[PDB]
Design a protein around this ligand. Structure first.
Ligand code: HEM
Ligand SMILES: CC(C)CCC[C@@H](C)[C@H]1CC[C@H]2[C@@H]3CC=C4C[C@@H](O)CC[C@]4(C)[C@H]3CC[C@]12C
Length: 460
């Protein structure tokens, strides 16, 4: 076992690395920086940038050793701006922000109503409804444009789908974002949500307290956005308590069981919504882009989906269990375009990775973006081939939703929502890339295309 002060990397120039990070770009190419640090220092490197320091690994085997020492209450990197808001408004921490036994106490209660197979089946009809209204929207636009084609950047529309779907199952109501003229309350709500994400980006590395001290508009807009979101939750709590005197949605059932305080219920319902809007819509954007750029894969998925429709006789539950290549396509999209460039875990016990001593408490990150594009771990990584996941075994290769007790609590909701989306979309339309020109990726909260993706939709 080699000492901890011998791990390769640049940790010996933490202040020079901070200057190199902010002098130009930097906060836009964190995923590209991760690739080179692995291609220069090997399967493990130790990084220090200012007061930030971490050990990074890329091999799935190493990720297994890491997830075995996360402890009973695993802890990742915190969302500085999001926590700052709860402290400023004296709001409770949700399941995403909590730690220690407080997180586990809440996580176990939330799991029953968010990720258990019992409630997943109660969501399929709700999600399918939203997915049916999305296909209706596309048909209208194809009518307007004429010639049976609609070339458009779907970024905004997918964001609406993700937000409409998530809020349907969380609050039990349709915001109506997919209409041509949504009501003002829902338009201001989606604008607040959008503004909430736009202001969180500059405060990922810029201390929120500093922006608050100078009364920056970035901090004030962040507070105004979260205010609208938390108010909307109260509106749904008030309407539910009035209906009191079925009950669809996570919010209603949590208020009926009453196992968590309403304050802790308000906090978790809000962080659940924020965790599945940008993530789901972006993953769908990359999926549609890769399908249009790999039309052969699109036909294969369309073939399997159509077959599943007949062999199920309308039964959605049966149909969702008959689309293996569709679930593999989701994995293949999250391999090339992970919503999180890395998973983080604070070590609770001394471990050894690549014959190196890793002291307890050290922050260790699993570079998802570097793993997905390494030819060693994935042969032909740059090819979008969903078959590489079918009848192959992995687990520690498909870490898109994390792993362990503190994995993504919405994975099944997202997987269902994206499967139902692709099912309805591929049954109705063919997606074609306007031009096979290359689209580069950039970092900003998640992996987003540097420039809008123009896709063409034709009825089929
Ligand atoms: C493509 C869709 C999605 C992707 C790729 C994704 C990815 C992730 C990842 C990687 C994590 C951290 C895993 C870890 O640290 O081990 C996470 C956590 C989380 N996700 Fe998702 N997510 C998606 C959709 C959703 C949805 C629809 C929800 C709805 C509630 C959601 C809610 C959450 C929450 C609350 C957490 C934090 C849970 C905790 O820390 O205990 N996500 N997600
Ligand atoms: C629970 C998480 C992982 C799911 C996705 C949430 C998205 C919207 C946001 C919220 C806080 C953000 C994280 C804040 C801090 C870091 C550490 C840095 O080195 C890379 C980005 C990373 C890791 C950000 C990634 C995206 C992040 C996780």
């Amino acid at each position: 076992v080699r000492p901890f002060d011998e791990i390769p990397g640049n940790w010996r120039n933490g202040w020079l690395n901070l200057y190199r990070f902010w002098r130009s770009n930097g906060f836009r190419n964190l995923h590209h920086i991760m690739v080179k640090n692995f291609n220069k220092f090997g399967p493990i490197y130790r990084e220090k940038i200012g007061y930030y320091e971490s050990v990074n690994i890329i091999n799935p085997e190493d990720a297994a050793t890491l997830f075995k020492a996360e402890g009973l209450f695993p802890r990742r990197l915190r969302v500085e701006p999001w926590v700052a808001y709860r402290d400023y408004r004296n709001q409770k921490y949700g399941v995403l922000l909590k730690n220690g036994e407080d997180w586990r106490s809440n996580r176990l209660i939330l799991n029953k109503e968010v990720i258990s197979p019992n409630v997943i089946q109660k969501f399929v009809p709700l999600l399918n409804e939203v997915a049916q209204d999305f296909v209706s929207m596309v048909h209208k636009q194809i009518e307007r444009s004429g010639r049976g084609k609609w070339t458009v950047d779907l970024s905004n529309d997918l964001f609406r789908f993700a937000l409409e779907s998530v809020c349907y199952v969380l609050y039990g109501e349709r915001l109506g974002l997919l209409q041509d003229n949504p009501n003002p309350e829902s338009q201001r709500f989606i604008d607040s949500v959008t503004l909430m994400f736009k202001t969180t980006s500059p405060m990922l590395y810029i201390p929120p307290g500093l922006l608050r001290r100078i009364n920056s508009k970035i901090w004030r807009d962040h507070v105004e956005a979260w205010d609208v979101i938390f108010n909307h939750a109260d509106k749904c709590i008030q309407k539910i308590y009035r209906q009191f005197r079925e009950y669809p949605g996570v919010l209603a059932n949590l208020l009926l069981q009453g196992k968590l305080p309403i304050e802790d219920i308000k906090a978790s319902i809000t962080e659940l919504m924020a965790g599945g809007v940008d993530t789901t819509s972006m993953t769908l954007l990359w999926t549609l882009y890769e399908l249009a750029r790999n039309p052969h894969v699109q036909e294969e998925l369309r073939a399997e989906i159509l077959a599943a429709r007949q062999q199920a006789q309308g039964d959605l539950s049966k149909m969702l269990k008959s689309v293996p290549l569709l679930k593999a396509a989701i994995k293949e999209t999250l391999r090339l375009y992970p919503v999180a460039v890395s998973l983080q875990r604070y070590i609770t016990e001394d471990i050894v990775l690549q014959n190196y001593h890793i002291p307890a408490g050290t922050l260790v990150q699993v570079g998802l973006y570097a793993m997905g594009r390494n030819p060693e771990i994935f042969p032909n990584p740059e090819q979008y081939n969903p078959e590489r996941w079918l009848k192959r075994e992995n687990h520690f290769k498909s870490l898109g939703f994390g792993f362990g007790p503190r994995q993504c609590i919405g994975r099944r909701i997202a997987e269902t929502e994206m499967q139902l989306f692709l099912i309805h979309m591929l049954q109705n339309f063919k997606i074609e890339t306007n031009s096979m020109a290359e689209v580069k990726t950039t970092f900003d909260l998640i992996l987003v295309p540097e420039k809008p993706i123009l896709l063409t939709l034709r009825p089929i």
